[PDB]
Amino acid sequence: MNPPPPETSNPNKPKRQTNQLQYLLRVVLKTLWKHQFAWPFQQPVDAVKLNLPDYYKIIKTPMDMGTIKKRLENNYYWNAQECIQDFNTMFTNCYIYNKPGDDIVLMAEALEKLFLQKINELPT
Numbered sequence: 001m002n003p004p005p006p007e008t009s010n011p012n013k014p015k016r017q018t019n020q021l022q023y024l025l026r027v028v029l030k031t032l033w034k035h036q037f038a039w040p041f042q043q044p045v046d047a048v049k050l051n052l053p054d055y056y057k058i059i060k061t062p063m064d065m066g067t068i069k070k071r072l073e074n075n076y077y078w079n080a081q082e083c084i085q086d087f088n089t090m091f092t093n094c095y096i097y098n099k100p101g102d103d104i105v106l107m108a109e110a111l112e113k114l115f116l117q118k119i120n121e122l123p124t
Ligand SMILES: O=C1CCCN1Cc1cc(Cl)c2cccnc2c1O
Pocket: 040, 041, 045, 050, 052, 093, 094, 097, 098, 104
């Protein structure tokens, strides 16, 4: 089985919209989305389809840009740092499950550098 995907809404959790969260969606996520290396990260890891049956035996806090996009569109986050933490979880998961120099890791590392450049300055 794949596990249930991470939540993209939670009525118990307070919502917020900030200039910085708007920028993470309009500029950061939407630019990374178009990168040629973004496709493995645009949805939860489908362990069944991809025949990685040990993925969720290893990765206990999964995250992906499809989930982040939905969360941003939902105003699920309280602040930009919560969203940035999801991006970092997504990258770290890929480095945990895979090995240095792997093709998928080279893709994550290219996205991560672009992500870091984009968040170097956020709006006020
Ligand atoms: O780790 C991550 C980060 C986002 C996707 N993903 C899982 C994944 C997907 C694919 Cl197509 C792989 C292909 C070859 C080797 N490894 C793979 C892999 O580990």
